[PDB]
Design an enzyme around this catalytic site. Structure first.
Site, short mmCIF file in Angstrom:
data_model
loop_
_atom_site.label_atom_id
_atom_site.label_comp_id
_atom_site.label_asym_id
_atom_site.label_seq_id
_atom_site.Cartn_x
_atom_site.Cartn_y
_atom_site.Cartn_z
N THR A 44 -52.21 -79.63 -97.52
CA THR A 44 -52.89 -80.31 -98.59
C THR A 44 -54.32 -79.80 -98.76
O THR A 44 -54.69 -79.41 -99.84
CB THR A 44 -52.94 -81.81 -98.25
OG1 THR A 44 -51.62 -82.31 -98.12
CG2 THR A 44 -53.66 -82.58 -99.35
N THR A 45 -55.05 -79.67 -97.64
CA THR A 45 -56.46 -79.27 -97.67
C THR A 45 -56.59 -77.80 -98.01
O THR A 45 -57.62 -77.35 -98.50
CB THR A 45 -57.10 -79.62 -96.33
OG1 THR A 45 -56.94 -80.99 -96.10
CG2 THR A 45 -58.59 -79.28 -96.34
N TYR A 107 -43.60 -87.76 -106.28
CA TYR A 107 -43.24 -88.02 -107.73
C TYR A 107 -41.86 -88.69 -107.95
O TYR A 107 -41.80 -89.71 -108.67
CB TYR A 107 -43.37 -86.74 -108.50
CG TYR A 107 -43.16 -86.89 -109.99
CD1 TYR A 107 -44.21 -87.08 -110.82
CD2 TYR A 107 -41.86 -86.94 -110.50
CE1 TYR A 107 -44.01 -87.25 -112.20
CE2 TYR A 107 -41.64 -87.06 -111.84
CZ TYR A 107 -42.74 -87.22 -112.70
OH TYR A 107 -42.51 -87.32 -114.05
N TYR A 133 -44.48 -85.53 -92.76
CA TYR A 133 -45.82 -85.86 -93.27
C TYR A 133 -45.71 -86.98 -94.24
O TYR A 133 -45.14 -86.80 -95.29
CB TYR A 133 -46.41 -84.61 -93.85
CG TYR A 133 -47.75 -84.63 -94.56
CD1 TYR A 133 -48.75 -85.66 -94.40
CD2 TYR A 133 -48.00 -83.64 -95.49
CE1 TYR A 133 -49.96 -85.54 -95.09
CE2 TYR A 133 -49.15 -83.62 -96.21
CZ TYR A 133 -50.14 -84.61 -96.01
OH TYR A 133 -51.30 -84.47 -96.76
N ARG A 138 -50.60 -90.06 -101.98
CA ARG A 138 -50.40 -88.87 -102.75
C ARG A 138 -49.00 -88.70 -103.39
O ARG A 138 -48.86 -88.02 -104.46
CB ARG A 138 -50.71 -87.61 -101.93
CG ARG A 138 -52.14 -87.46 -101.45
CD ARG A 138 -52.24 -86.13 -100.72
NE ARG A 138 -53.60 -86.00 -100.15
CZ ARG A 138 -54.70 -85.65 -100.82
NH1 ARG A 138 -54.64 -85.31 -102.10
NH2 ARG A 138 -55.85 -85.49 -100.16
N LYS A 161 -47.04 -86.55 -88.94
CA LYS A 161 -48.42 -86.70 -89.36
C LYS A 161 -48.44 -87.95 -90.25
O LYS A 161 -47.88 -87.93 -91.38
CB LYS A 161 -48.89 -85.50 -90.15
CG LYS A 161 -50.30 -85.67 -90.71
CD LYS A 161 -50.68 -84.55 -91.60
CE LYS A 161 -52.03 -84.61 -92.27
NZ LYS A 161 -52.29 -83.59 -93.34
N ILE A 203 -54.32 -84.16 -87.39
CA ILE A 203 -54.33 -83.06 -88.31
C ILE A 203 -55.46 -83.36 -89.25
O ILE A 203 -55.38 -84.34 -90.02
CB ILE A 203 -52.98 -82.79 -89.01
CG1 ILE A 203 -52.03 -82.26 -87.95
CG2 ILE A 203 -53.13 -81.75 -90.15
CD1 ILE A 203 -50.59 -82.23 -88.43
#
Ligand SMILES: [K+]
Ligand SMILES: [K+]
Ligand SMILES: [K+]
Ligand SMILES: [K+]
Lengths: 292, 292, 292, 292
Positions: A44-45, A107, A133, A138, A161, A203
């Site tokens: 993501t980052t 989504y 994750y 999100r 995570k 993380i």
């Protein structure tokens, strides 16, 4: 390696938005030197969202080449279609990554049974370790402890995570899984609490700019020395919060540039340049951490 | 048009998970006969998340061919990367669609300034009309009225599908935009209320299986006949609710199969086949609406 | 005493709704014998809401008389008007209670500054120790850690019952207060986690029916033996959840009756008798705990 | 009546915190002159939470005396204990009020069956008309449409003040009750929308300081002139928002003082005097509405 301080590494870019190899090398050397346990590449980052599949594989391969066996690499590999997730995971088999960080479908909001089938099928079709994750803020969907319990029975599904920031999940999950299943915080602000409750590491976004302090904090936590870890955590807490004052990784990229770790703070639309007000909040957090 | 009952049409599949042309033709003929105003092709309910970009284009092109100018076709065209959304949209220039239903970036949670730049750039690289689509429960991003107001100034951003279920948004947006900006509901259960407040129609899931009722409801609404409209709404209210008893489009595909509208209810993972309990629930809703 | 397992005691009633002295004596003897640290008299679980001021004082005085110095008593004393809270607190000065449990104003939703003035003024006008009670789900207002930090400087404000279930509050508060400030969970389901994070005990509903196991769990937690405490917690977890399957204290009063601890399960309107479905869920939880 | 603009009137105080008769007279005359339809005396905005039951009755009796038959008066009369609500209501039998605004039990979070029994019992022990009041943000209890439907069958339960701000509730309740059950908004910011959906008026905070505008808005609404109504709404929208910049009635009392309607802005703890920032905010809102 799946314990301790694991960095959710930025993907540094030049002014045109293309990956900057020199900046990436500087980051990887910094993590090797600073005692970071592993690198999550194109999570993501790392702007997984905005890199094409070619770029995504190129960055992971460049990260592995630059790491040169000195630090383990985990690739970000989720997708919201199960056939796609399988497809992309195949492309990394035999790459040299130690594992995959695979996000819950975003989504399309699948049921718990849908999540079970998705992840079971991904794991069936690789020998690579998979780290689930969960980040409902999100994706719109929340992988619940019961389903994590079912999935932990799959040989290759080795940990999670947990990015909700809901600390009750730590022992809800632990009691349903075997003692070798890894619980990793995905919420820097609550990560020390997460480890104190029985989590195994983090993380981390903050680790991008405070790698040594993060690695020491997580070791103290692992040894049970929570009061000592909490001293470090209190100095990092402004960063843990203010690295999200604008959408991640906007603030952390600006912080990396300010420290000299990367050449430019450029991101890809729809991520925008940091505002002036953001720069000032982040720089004050960096000063609180003792980094400026 | 961009008014009245607009169907968020299912992508009917064979048992292998590929588009069933016979079923799609049957649906499209049903909509033409029923008085549906337009078709949104490969939106959310059409499994946009689990078709690849070529499959997606094949469905849109097939839908236009089959519609044969009898009913306008809008394509679902989001991406969470701006560069990609622009390319993906460019592909439909001169296809025959009348516009695009473009979703807010999902997962990466951009700022309002980021949303403004993303949509503005998309609109600048096409001549097709764009309908914004706000559905924070799926995307983790909420496109606020102030930003809609700013975007409505862009010539070819022409309306919004507001799928929050938050009815206060109708007049908050209406007061910031000109009288020809279109406001459509994206939440069947509150759509009649949304029209009663000044909205112009609905992009409907329920219309897949109650197209005539939905079109008659929307006509009555547009004519100010709300009491009359509401009788139809009450008949359909269990459908509006229970077509989300399990994740959309799981219920609505089963319902289409049970009505003889499509050959199979097959979906792609991570969407799962409907449970026994869900079947009974949706069947009672269909009975209530008088369709079974 | 302000550490360990503290029972939020029911106020047992006969079929007419009046306090049942014989049942109360049975409960108090049970707590003395079972190692409960203290009794909160006429708290939330004691139907503070529905007793008049005469009844409220009578129950606290009867509890003190029956306890006969064998176990400390804390009275429930909040109000949503500051002058009232002061007034009611005066009435207990020199009663023999060891402390007051004072809830945040409910319904009128004061600012943090308002909360500061409210509690500061209450504390100014008594020598009794005050334990702040934060329960936003009931009051509509959330006493934040910063304000708890300001209030902890007041000599007589000695701790907090933190009933949000938000475990991040434990170390947010701890870092702002002195080491003698007591942190008590007010959420049975998260209370062991709360103690593991640094909390000092629990003001517990479950303790009404599982006093010995609660007292052992909290002692193990205080000694650091979390794995051992968690075995007990796992057996109690169905009760921790199912004692809220209907509004508290409906389920716990029915459980006390089923165990023979009180003569009747009667409550005052607007609390209603337990449903059949509730009885079955609670009895299964009691069997899981090993109590039936 | 129970229609049009109904003021939730402030209890103006002297510097000591007691009711100011001169100020109350001035307000009541203002409402009569302005065309306000009715006055709710000692509701939420009138500091019902911090007056004792005698003080509360004194205010209601004084308000009726001063109104001198020129404008109907409804008393706030909730309690969270059923026996107490019945006694507290009985006191106003034959006072001259035209009805009671009775709040859902706060803090004790009864079941829907509990809410049904509470209100049914209140209604059975009086001949005064009862208006239910749903405000879960203050009470922690949400009175659902199905329960309103059940209660609307009780002869003297005659309407609801719906203060959720959830506009879908208008038609959910309207479809379950007869055409003479009154639906009033309790949320100024969404009240015009609520009336546009079929509601009959508003119990308004804003009406304390913009009574003529509020009455003209509500008349236009009742006549179907929504565009006209909305121009007045837009002028008042900053007031509708900023009279809650700090906890109600802190802003609205300051505003009343600034307009010369009351002698002092004094409130009772835990309500606090308005901050400097809040003053500037409310002053800008008053300027916007043209009242300063
Ligand atoms: K495993
Ligand atoms: K436009
Ligand atoms: K203190
Ligand atoms: K009635």
């Amino acid at each position: 390696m799946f314990t301790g301080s694991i960095v959710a590494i930025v993907t540094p870019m030049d002014e045109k938005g293309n990956v900057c190899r020199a900046s990436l090398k500087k980051l990887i050397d910094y993590h090797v030197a600073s005692g970071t346990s592993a690198i999550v590449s194109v999570g993501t980052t790392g702007e997984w969202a905005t890199l094409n599949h070619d770029e995504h594989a190129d960055v992971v391969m460049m990260t592995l080449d630059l790491a040169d066996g000195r630090i383990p690499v985990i690739a970000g590999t989720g997708a919201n279609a199960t056939a796609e997730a399988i497809s992309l995971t195949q492309r990394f088999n035999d790459s040299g990554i130690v594992g995959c960080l695979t996000v819950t479908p975003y989504y399309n909001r699948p049921s718990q049974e849908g999540l079970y089938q998705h992840f079971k099928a991904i794991a069936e079709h690789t020998d690579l370790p998979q780290i689930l994750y969960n980040v409902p803020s999100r994706t719109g969907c929340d992988l619940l402890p019961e389903t994590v319990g079912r999935l932990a029975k799959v040989k290759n599904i080795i940990g999670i995570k947990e990015a909700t920031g809901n600390l009750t999940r730590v022992n809800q999950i632990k009691e349903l899984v075997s003692d070798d299943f890894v619980l990793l915080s995905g919420d820097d602000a609550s990560a020390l609490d997460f480890m104190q409750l029985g989590g195994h590491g983090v993380i981390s976004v903050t680790a991008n700019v405070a790698a040594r302090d993060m690695a020491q904090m997580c070791k103290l936590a692992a040894e049970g020395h929570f009061a000592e870890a909490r001293v470090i955590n209190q100095r990092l807490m402004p960063l843990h919060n203010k690295l999200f004052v604008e959408p991640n990784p906007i603030p952390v990229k600006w912080a990396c540039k300010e420290l000299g770790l990367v050449a430019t703070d450029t991101l890809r639309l729809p991520m925008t340049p940091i505002t002036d007000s953001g720069r000032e909040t982040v720089r004050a957090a960096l000063k609180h951490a003792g980094l400026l």
